[model samples]
Target: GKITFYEDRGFQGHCYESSSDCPNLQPYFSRCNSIRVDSGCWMLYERPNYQGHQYFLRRGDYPDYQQWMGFNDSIRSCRLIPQHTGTFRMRIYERDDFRGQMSEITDDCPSLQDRFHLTEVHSLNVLEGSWVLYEMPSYRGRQYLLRPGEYRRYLDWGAMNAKVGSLRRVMDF
Candidate 1:
């Protein structure tokens, strides 16, 4: 199976501050967080601050709040930073940021410890390109690729940000 990474559209980065005072949704004060997708969608792991937190977001849900709803290349905003410390990474996939719809895939996963362990299954600390792409079946969506060069190179279109919300573990697998 081949994994697809989201191509950066050079979109704005902003965080969801809070839900409106009176939202009709159950989680009125809906806040943004992080997510993990076993398959699909294009995203990247970004360590924006000194603290260790990876930016795993879709093209739709980029922390870029100002230009979040509509696409606009004109806006100076701060990027979203997860409060923690450690190595960070990103994952790309297919589909919108799951803002309008809820995703069966993706979850907010934090390092089990302050530092990460390396293993055939897991490990602490990150080595350059020390990540694997979890490939899954594909659908009618966008995709990104890695090009050979001094640094990792990518490309793509019609990308959305990765959606982050409270996720409850499901027993049914």
Candidate 2:
């Protein structure tokens, strides 16, 4: 369900697309802005190997970088999003190894600090479906695609640090 990429607006400069992970899609320009997410969700990486700034996108057409390229630059790597669209649940702990204060999260969450009263997430337990753990509040900054599993530490979800600003379910199609 994944395919298509164009370096110019409205499908101009269109190039062949891939359906799997692309660690590096060499580009003439420093930015890979225009894209079509036919598969639903996708994680864009500014650097190779899914590293650096992450930009999450859903099914649609992106005619320009200004639309969602908040950080800007080459999206060298791309990861197709996995699926599931029902019942979102997860447990977040303030300390590692599932320690410290705990909070049960069952829906889309934003500005987590307002509810947790803390800015860091040491551990996480996603009970069902997929979720995006954003590095900053209000869905800004890098994002981590979290699937159903146990994350004993923030690093498990590719976080350079433990601070999580918000959480959103990956159910919107």
Candidate 3:
């Protein structure tokens, strides 16, 4: 997970390189105007200590902060999102702590309501590839990235509610 940041637009001015999470970028070179994500998926925070607005960034060149989903001209922290391998395997539970009926998904689930007759997923076990859970169907709304692990509750993934409408493999993107 390598990334480079520039203090001026168009990859000019002071530069900083990082291959890991930077909780305090202020010590680097103030604010960032441009960035080059050399490898891996990443999340850029608008404030220091990984706080405030978060912007997801893939491997690519962002000439300016605006190029990052029209973000404002400020970025103070960043962390590399872990990349996964193998097929996507996950099980969603109807209740927290892996209780109640469960549905195993190997591929994208466009609608939990239609496939498993489930509208709310309180827990999850991601056994393989990285996945993105959406709050709405068709891959819309708030998103939570799930790596290979067990999330005993919705809050374990930092979800505000248990309402999960859809999910997709991160590699598919």
Candidate 4:
């Protein structure tokens, strides 16, 4: 039940193809949604889906709680600003926002092969120990915190170590 920043390109309409069709897939990469303390902003994050359809990530506690991913209409990204960080829980609105037009988040996502290969590639890469961002190949130099495999609390502490203020912030507890 933690709040981790997540981002994915909402690519539309992709299907079986070869390496030569890669260039045509560029347009799908666009718009990233995120929550930053200082200034909340959403950037354009584009990526090829191989399956002609939009893409999105769900926001909830469990990995698969908000885990429904696909090219359905009304795809969305969400941010929950905590007034205070205590035990917080809220119900999702069935509006055009967070949950899309669907009644509930379906467990049926992409196949294991497609999920691993496609989602990982399209999903934002967060650097391991540092909050410093990394550019997903489709993002045209977009940034995200590195992943654990590459994150190093000691090695990454170079001036840009702070998460909010000047003091260098440590890795997750």
Candidate 5:
């Protein structure tokens, strides 16, 4: 995947293109105001080395940071996520270690609590494709990307706790 970060709004100003993950993109540009993803999915971070706020992006044009729902103009790192084909599948459990009630998800859930009736998802099993977990509804708050596999506990997915408000499938357009 390739991504270009611009220093000014509407894809203006100085820019730097990256074909792979960048642990520290600060050296590339002073500040990012816009971005262009030429291919594949990507995880953009507010801080360096993939820390702080995260925004998922696919091949598209973001005229400004607001286009990607970013919190600020600082984009310090990025990780090009693998594209997934076929069905998007995952199961969120009520308790840890895949115990308690189960909810198999095949598509994006804007509100896990409202749709699945689960306030806290303690465990997860990704059978196909990739997904992002949100700490707040409408895809706001903390974010965590999950690859195909089983996460016995919330920490396995780099979450602070089991509070998941939304789930989005990582698929290419």
Candidate 6:
């Protein structure tokens, strides 16, 4: 996907366009106050070289940094989420190392609390395709990319804690 970053809010000021991983975006612009995802999905990093807080964005227009829940106008890196085609399957656990109550799912979960009667997913096992974990119910807030693998703990998926509110497969276009 192609993404345009603006140095000032409301899509103004110096801008940089990229369709791939950008480790250092400072050379083109001082700071990113707004963004526009032309197509596909992307992950924006707060710090340079893909470090710091992450915000997942799909094809849309973010008029300002606040639209992406950014604390300040400083986006230093970005990565495009590759498209994939496959069935979706996963096992969620309530504790690390795949221990504790587990539930298998092949469909999207808008609210884990409603499905499992509880929240706080400590671990997960992705069997197929790519998945995105959301921090809020109905697939809102921060997002974590999860490919086919075993996430021994929430931290294994780059999460600050075990508080997954929703999840869904990355469907191909």
Best-fitting candidate, measured by TM-score?
A: 6
**lDDT by residue (tens digit), candidate 2, 86-121:** 678899997999998889998888989887787899
Q: Looking at model 1, which ten-residue stretch has the lowest summed lDDT?
A: 116-125
Report the lDDT tens digits of candidate 3 across residue range 1-173: 78899999999999999999889888888878888988877777778876655666778899988777535767888877766666779998888899988888999888988888887898999998877787878766666667789999988876788999989776513
RMSD of 5: 2.0
Candidate 4 lDDT over residue span 1-173, tens digit each: 22232233222223121211232323332222321122221111133322222222222221221233322222122222112222212111222123322221112222222332321221121222222222232221223322223222322322122121111111222
User: What's the lDDT of the predicted structure labeled candidate 6?
Assistant: 0.85
List, residue by residue over 1-173, the lDDT tens digit for candidate 1: 11211222332223223211111211221222222223322223221111111122232334332223222222212122122223323332222231221112132233211112211111111222222122111111122121111111111111132222111111112
lDDT for 93 in candidate 1 is: 21
What are the lDDT scores of the predictions, listed in order?
A: 0.22, 0.80, 0.81, 0.23, 0.89, 0.85
Report model 1's TM-score to 2 decimal places: 0.16
Estimate, for each residue in 44-145, the C-alpha lDDT of model 5 and write its tens digit. Answer: 999998888888888889998888889999999999888777889998898999999888999889997789877789999999988988999988888888
Give candidate 1 regions above 4 Å deviation.
1-28, 31-55, 61-119, 128-173
**Candidate 3 residue spans exceeding 4 A from truth:** 7-13, 46-53, 64-66, 70-74, 110-118
Ranking by TM-score: 6, 5, 2, 3, 1, 4
Q: Give the TM-scores of the predictions, in the order they appear.
A: 0.16, 0.84, 0.74, 0.16, 0.87, 0.88
Task: Give candidate 3's root-mean-square deviation (CA, Å).
Answer: 3.2
What is candidate 3's CA lDDT for residue 88?
A: 76
Off by over 4 Å in 4: 1-128, 134-140, 151-173
The order of the candidates by lDDT, greatest first, is: 5, 6, 3, 2, 4, 1
Candidate 5 regions off by >4 Å? none
